[PDB]
């Protein structure tokens with residue numbers, strides 16, 4: 001079978017403009033394991049990004065956590081972009097500090 | 100006691116074509132990674148200073164040898180038998196094996212395998228049992244594995260003798276980290292409108308350990324049954340994140356509070372007011 005990914009974006013701490021935080025993109029529920037995940041700042045790829053080693057759930061579906069330090073500002077837009085064999089194009093999920 | 104009560108290793112082996120297999124592997128206590136695996140050399144990466152538990156450096160090197168030889172050997176054999184088993188590329192195999200401590204002191208061991216993201220086999224009382232979703236392929240596989248010298252006896256010893264020793268030893272070795280209590284922070288926001296004259300009240304709870312947590316919206320002592328909990332999501336530092344949302348009328352927010360209870364906060368419940 002195959003499974004499309006779920007994508008959840010969230011900061012570690014409440015956002016405070018100009019204060020250092022961690023931006024997280026949790027990608028889960030997908031199969032097969034090959035996947036491409038970028039964090040974006042104003043539409044451009046962030047270079048420094050950390051991720052977990054691959055793991056999977058009880059139903060055999062995979063999951064990964066991508067994360068980077070960042071400083072939220074008022075202007076700057078952040079997002080997670082995922083590509084997977086099950087998607088007819090890349091999925092982009094924006095960070096929204098109020099969700 | 101609190102924190103994890105099980106240890107397991109996983110395997111993900113991805114077969115692109117006859118030339119190209121890749122295997123990814125790791126060791127876990129529940130949800131917390133404690134071993135990595137460097138695929139190319141076939142060696143373990145110990146992620147915590149107590150990840151060897153109470154095992155000797157010699158027994159650990161011997162276990163890494165077992166897993167190295169299993170991983171390359173398995174990948175080679177799969178590639179060599181893919182024609183016979185009518186496999187189409189690409190395909191992906193997964194495995195999980197380990198043991199778990201039950202409330203009465205009983206330790207139960209398990210091993211399961213997958214193909215195509217579906218159950219393929221399991222080990223039940225020392226034998227290979229094919230799963231229904233694996234079909235005639237899984238039957239063939241379990242009829243074949245018993246022909247290999249030492250495989251089934253090694254799997255037996257690792258599951259039922261080695262794993263329970265390792266698990267009690269590492270839960271004891273890592274107990275200062277594993278049973279630590281870490282208090283969350285919490286905060287409120289107004290989420291995307293769920294509709295005209297409605298507000299989405301969001302209560303965020305982040306940085307708790309261990310994982311079990313309780314979060315509810317309230318009007319004084321009254322639980323709001325409309326509370327929706329999100330997924331518990333990981334942070335990178337061995338803590339978790341969760342939101343609880345309540346869809347409320349635009350004039351009904353006042354008097355509402357988010358209440359958080361956690362093992363680290365006994366006598367210290369967090370209560371946050373919207374207005």
Ligand SMILES: CCCCCCCCCCCCCCCC[C@H](C)C[C@H](C)C[C@H](C)/C=C(\C)C(=O)O[C@H]1[C@H](O)[C@@H](CO)O[C@H](O[C@H]2O[C@H](CO)[C@@H](O)[C@H](O)[C@H]2OS(=O)(=O)O)[C@@H]1OC(=O)CCCCCCCCCCCCCCC
Pocket residue numbers: 108162164165166168169170172173175176196197210222227244247248249250253254257258261262265
């Ligand atoms: C922390 C604790 C947590 C615990 C929880 C985990 C709990 C559970 C974790 C599960 C992990 C399972 C690991 C079990 C694997 C066993 C160790 C991997 C091996 C250990 C060293 C002794 C064993 C008994 C066999 C050895 C050492 C061995 O060398 O085997 C060969 C032996 O070296 C040689 C004489 O030297 O004769 C044959 O080798 C020939 O045939 C092979 C297969 O065709 C060829 O690849 C090989 O080149 C060839 O050599 S040749 O020179 O003869 O041609 C033997 O053939 C053989 O019998 C095959 C051995 C070679 C690897 C083949 C693996 C493929 C099948 C795997 C399916 C099993 C999955 C589980 C399903 C339920």
Ligand SMILES: *[C@@H]1O[C@H](CO[C@@H]2O[C@@H](C)[C@@H](O)[C@@H](O)[C@@H]2O)[C@@H](O[C@@H]2O[C@H](CO)[C@@H](O[C@@H]3O[C@H](CO[C@H]4O[C@H](CO)[C@@H](O)[C@H](O)[C@@H]4O)[C@@H](O)[C@H](O)[C@@H]3O)[C@H](O)[C@H]2NC(C)=O)[C@H](O)[C@H]1NC(C)=O
Pocket residue numbers: 153154155204206260263264265267268271
């Ligand atoms: C690493 O640690 C393991 C586990 O040891 C224990 O847990 C740690 C944290 C300490 O608190 C120890 O006090 C505990 O013993 C050790 O494994 C065990 O070794 C002891 C000593 O040989 C074994 O105790 C014997 O067990 C017999 C009866 O118990 C039966 O029930 C258990 C339930 O767990 C079952 O697992 C087991 O099959 C037993 O048959 C008894 O004959 C004898 O008198 C004595 O009580 C104990 O059983 C072992 N536990 C397990 C789970 O295997 C390791 O030896 C240690 N080192 C290494 C290198 O592994």
Ligand SMILES: CCCCCCCCCCCCCCCCCCCCCCCCCCCCCCCCCCCCCCCC
Pocket residue numbers: 108109110124125126134135136143144150151154159162163166176177178180181184186192193194195196210211212213214219220236240243244247265
């Ligand atoms: C432990 C304390 C200190 C040491 C720690 C070292 C830990 C580091 C992590 C190690 C991680 C790597 C090891 C990973 C081992 C995971 C074990 C999980 C076992 C389950 C896999 C079972 C099989 C998986 C399911 C099998 C599916 C088969 C699909 C059909 C393929 C058909 C084509 C050919 C088939 C024929 C092959 C014939 C073969 C003899």
Ligand SMILES: *[C@@H]1O[C@H](CO[C@@H]2O[C@@H](C)[C@@H](O)[C@@H](O)[C@@H]2O)[C@@H](O)[C@H](O)[C@H]1NC(C)=O
Pocket residue numbers: 034115116117118119121
């Ligand atoms: C076999 O595979 C080689 C590797 O291809 C790829 O690498 C792997 C890890 C996958 O990520 C896959 O998506 C890539 O396409 C090929 O480069 C090679 O040509 C292939 N050989 C033959 C004969 O088909």
